[PDB]
Symmetry: C3
């Protein structure tokens, strides 16, 4: 049957087109792929002055709110903190969140099994005028985090500038690339701000813009903490010039339920010696967690992948022809 022959030829044409069109070109089979080695470097430029009630103005610079000062892909930017100054080790009252005692007989000498705040001496001392707490041994100024200021202390950190330095290199092809490209020059970085469409190559990122691109409001993240995920893509083709290789930045919002465990927070201390006595300052920092992940793939022409793809295409064409013959045979 002439019609049957035409159908067989048509099937052959479709599969032949598919192997050259998709496997060879869309999937870039003629090229080999390998991994890269990336190093993330971050730098902040911003200053926020927070005036605490009953205390002098406090100046914070890049070294203050950037706790990973050495440089890492995962860093926290301080936006709100609770300061407990002049802490000293001694016998004093604990926080009321642990327990409330009405007499000395209720207190038990020892340490709490869960959420321990210190070594209980065994006496009930008044925490304030109304309630009384157990007497413990340790830092007497307790971190009273029951009251969180609604206005963010470091609210100026919204429209600051963030610089990300990423250098990637493919060991198979021995090609090294950096986030700074030929289009980006010295004068450009002096005034550019990163944008999704306008300035995709500007390495100066705005914290508020980064938070808004992920889908989160900066006010709540500055108040109670947050997590922002940043991803850098390096998919490119090595057949063209290295100028075409440009990184693509994507921002993802990592958030959960607001009722249980809202935001991100931690604690750190600064130990010092004043008047011959060891003292420290404890801070409950509510900062935004920034995570940077780099992943990319590069392809360059090679003969062995091309031959393997040609063989696979010939095999698929043969299998398709045999299946078409079996179907036409019925």
């Amino acid at each position: 049957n002439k019609k049957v022959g035409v159908i067989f030829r048509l099937i052959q044409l479709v599969v032949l087109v598919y192997v050259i069109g998709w496997v060879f070109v869309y999937e870039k089979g003629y090229q080999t792929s390998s991994g890269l080695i990336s190093s993330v470097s971050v730098k902040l430029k911003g200053l926020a002055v927070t005036q605490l009630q009953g205390l002098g103005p406090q100046v914070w610079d890049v070294a203050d709110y950037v706790f990973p000062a050495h440089g890492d892909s995962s860093f926290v930017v301080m936006t709100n903190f609770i300061m407990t100054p002049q802490q000293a080790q001694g016998h004093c009252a604990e926080n009321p969140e642990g327990g409330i005692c009405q007499d000395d007989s209720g207190c038990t000498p020892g340490k709490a099994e869960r959420k321990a705040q210190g070594i209980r001496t065994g006496n009930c001392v008044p925490f304030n005028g109304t309630v009384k707490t157990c007497e413990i041994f340790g830092w007497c100024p307790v971190e009273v985090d029951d009251k969180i200021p609604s206005p963010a202390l470091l609210h100026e950190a919204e429209n600051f500038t963030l610089f990300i330095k990423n250098s990637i290199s493919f060991p198979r092809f021995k090609v090294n690339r950096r986030n700074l490209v030929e289009e980006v020059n010295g004068t450009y970085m002096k005034k550019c701000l990163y944008h999704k469409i306008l300035h995709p190559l500007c390495p100066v990122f705005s914290l508020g813009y980064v938070v808004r691109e992920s889908g989160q409001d900066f006010r709540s993240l500055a108040e109670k903490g947050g997590v922002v995920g940043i991803t850098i893509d390096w998919e490119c083709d090595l057949d063209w010039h290295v100028r075409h290789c440009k990184p693509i930045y994507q921002f993802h919002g990592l958030y959960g339920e607001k009722n249980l465990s809202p935001g991100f927070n931690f604690r750190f201390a600064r130990h010092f010696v004043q008047n011959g006595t060891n003292r420290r300052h404890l801070f409950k920092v509510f900062g935004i967690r920034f995570d940077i992940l780099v992943d990319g793939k590069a392809g360059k022409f090679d003969i062995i992948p091309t031959m393997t793809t040609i063989g696979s295409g010939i095999g698929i064409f043969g299998v398709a022809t045999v299946l078409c013959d079996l179907l036409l045979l019925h």
Copy 2:
């Protein structure tokens, strides 16, 4: 032969069964896979008081034994330390491990090529009553780690509480999930402890339980340090409801031979100014290294993967039928 025909049918059915079940149901081939972006948040709530000989009691709160206070997937929990207080720079004796001198002629001015402890002045000073060491320019109180206390100083860190907050999101499906599943509530986290069977969803992990589940003893590990690997896997099917997404916590023991380089240790210093002189406190912290790695995949029904799997199954079926025909013809 009727029997030969039956054999052909039997092979044909079994290959069809394999494509129908293993390829689909088991492998979720009709479902696409994509990576996730994860951010690890850790918080400790424990207190240990160490009372060394010759010094007052020292209280170590969360800000003390957690050196990565900012928060990272890789953190060290202090369990044992060697304190060398009131260090000041000057010309004084070195450690006996560097070298032993019997006269001033044996000492050579300069710096040691390997394991240098300071700049030698060229004089031999007595380290103690018996032996003499080279005079170097550096911190006079030399950390002598020859004696390691068998009882762990921060031995209370065994049954403390560790909270791990992990937020994962898939960019392909735009679905965000957190380790705090809907089954876990606020009252549940107040008194729950993680267990493989009892409480698999409780985000509160006990350090001693984590060490026991890794095939290690907490005492011998904390005596000299160690490394514990924690892996969180997110294997869920997006075809069902989002409540089915439940993280899996697995603990792996990363240990080596104890005869060569036992445990894990490091050194850090706290710089301060006392009486107009710059001093510091050096600690050789023997702590357990905790590494948290998150890796998971998601699967949702899609048309293109389903069509590709159907085509591959049809091709495999045709190839199997042709091979059976060729074998039966011989």
Copy 3:
């Protein structure tokens, strides 16, 4: 035809040889593969004395130039720094890089939008004898990083010793391995330096040797900063003894163009209290960024991968025979 059959037999033999020769053995199709759980531990040794102009000799031990003292795969080794001591908050002049004012009317009260150094009070004060800068509210001693010393301060860090402790464990096969192997003993670690050919198993890496193996000169990296990428490979076969499993170290140079943002640098501060006044020391550290990434694969004999590879080879052989028959047909 005889020659046609001879050519056919030859081709079928060649494909059969290929499947057993390459897919089965070269590719180790029979074995199953899985990932590992790695944990990098680093420890530095060495001392550098930087005698600054008009200041006493400063001793820098391991805890000083190693900012990630707790231990991490990504760490920075200090090689050059700019010290700005005795910083205190107050009203004073700013850096000339922010702006130059000739009168008090030019200054505007508030904070700079980009590269902010403090809160301007609206007054123009002379920074030095020649030029005048805006008056800000913050740390009065400004980090004047216009002059970078050409000789590296911590130039002794070139030929120091770096020890890397890596423990990997395959969860599928329950096999734990460490960078220390049976060939490496206690006496060997006392005196050895890592080499590409001589000492591939010595865990003591020289910083200068690591920098030179990556293709970068250590002098420029100590002067203005640099990034060095280290990779550890754990490809091995579990069919043999565990002694054959040996790590392979590869060093990669991560660098960019020298005109725009050359090297790596950061800033950190050490807070202290002297004479009842809060002070700090700011340092602009020019250090080399070391990134350690571990990846490996282990294979062990299994029956299911062997059967799948045999089936795939039989299918490929059948497809090749069918294609040969079709070619011989016409």
